[PDB]
Symmetry: C2
Subunit: 82 residues, 2 copies
């Protein structure tokens, strides 16, 4: 029951449209998520952002993202040295 | 059993470190994921990337990301008009 907000990461595709790479559900119990939600909705005066200010802030987020490729351990490597 | 690759999105935090916002598991059955994996590992000659080339490509990804905030429908709104 009820709705929630999502942070979606889109990337341009060869057909000139885009594709949604990953989605992040912003849980109300997560102070990071709510800081993100507030940042992308409200202008630190209560006032909902103009689409311009929203698009600017989305861009500003992007500009500070860091992308890292990570490989997890295999079960063989993670097994306890027993 | 076995390992897998992940695409991690980090963001800088007020303590001057960072936090991992979202992680994307790159499934071997997903041609998008494998195109991403190849892009971040290999230099279209077979040759594994230098850390420099890797960091450059990570940045290039970031530069073309589009972030959108999306709200899903509540159960009340999504209910069938029955």
């Amino acid at each position: 029951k009820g709705a929630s907000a999502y942070l979606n990461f889109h990337f341009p595709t060869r057909d000139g449209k885009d594709v949604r790479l990953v989605s992040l559900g912003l849980r109300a119990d997560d102070a990071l998520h709510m800081q993100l939600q507030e940042f992308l909705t409200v202008d630190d005066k209560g006032k909902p952002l103009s689409e311009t200010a929203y698009a600017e802030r989305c861009k500003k987020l992007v500009s500070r993202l860091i992308i890292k490729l990570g490989v997890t351990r295999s079960e063989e490597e993670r097994a306890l040295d027993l």
